[PDB]
Symmetry: C2
Subunit: 150 residues, 2 copies
Amino acid sequence: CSPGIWQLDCTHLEGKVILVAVHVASGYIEAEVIPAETGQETAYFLLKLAGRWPVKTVHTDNGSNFTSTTVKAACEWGGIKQEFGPQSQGVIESMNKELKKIIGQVRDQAEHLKTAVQMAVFIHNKKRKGGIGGYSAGERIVDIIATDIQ
Amino acid sequence: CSPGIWQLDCTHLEGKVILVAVHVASGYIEAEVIPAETGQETAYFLLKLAGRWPVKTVHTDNGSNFTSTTVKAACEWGGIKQEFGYNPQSQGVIESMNKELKKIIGQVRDQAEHLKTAVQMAVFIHNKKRKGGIGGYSAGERIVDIIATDIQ
Ligand SMILES: O=C(/C=C(\O)c1nn[nH]n1)c1c[nH]c2ccc(Cl)cc12
Ligand SMILES: [Mg+2]
Ligand SMILES: [Mg+2]
């Protein structure tokens, strides 16, 4: 769908919180282990994401971190519209699961879970699952946004 | 020079350490306050960066964090080449961004509680900023434009 629409949600592993962001139009993802599942940490993650890509709308569940006033402020400052309401919504579920999968496969290649999370994100966005000539998630997002500039 | 070259360096504000990364060919930047100017923190930042954009070469000075083994390993895993320490197309690029970033931070400090948040606001403003505030491309649009064309 729209190039400025993102979906955010939290998953968990080893008793830690993993904040996930997905660019629905491309499948590109960004994720990070955060100290706690709060609005403060969620707001910080979003500001970084927004300063990186054209984040126009973020879809999430009614998680207290996502409905907190601090995240509301961050979205306002960044000009981001919040929404709490084709295979969508389950996309975030699939991505969360897919991420935990890749993390599982590379978990022993790194000391801390946080490092493993970043390696998994790298693998996911760099992965060329389509035949030669196809685009990875990383290439798709830059392609989608570039074409939307002109 | 190429769409895969980045320069990295640390700057300091309020007694804190800000790790800065600049995509030379576009002026696009990413920054973040880190608890300590160590290799572990630097490697983590690089891994995150590498998974988002095409990072093939990283240019830095010889700060202990940048020459560390942990950074060397992250780079090895990521397929990133390293260079420590003239060329008009790179001369003082990171230096200029450290000031530009600091200036923007000074302007939006109040809008934020901690320094960490201010930095991310500064980065947001820098990447979206247009010369004279009218038309042309911002750093954010230049990087995606440069990368997009290279893909073809
Ligand atoms: O099923 C999910 C997530 C997972 O199954 C999941 N598994 N591992 N990490 N996440 C969901 C993600 N967003 C939602 C909104 C409403 C409802 Cl009822 C469910 C979900
Ligand atoms: Mg949830
Ligand atoms: Mg230095």
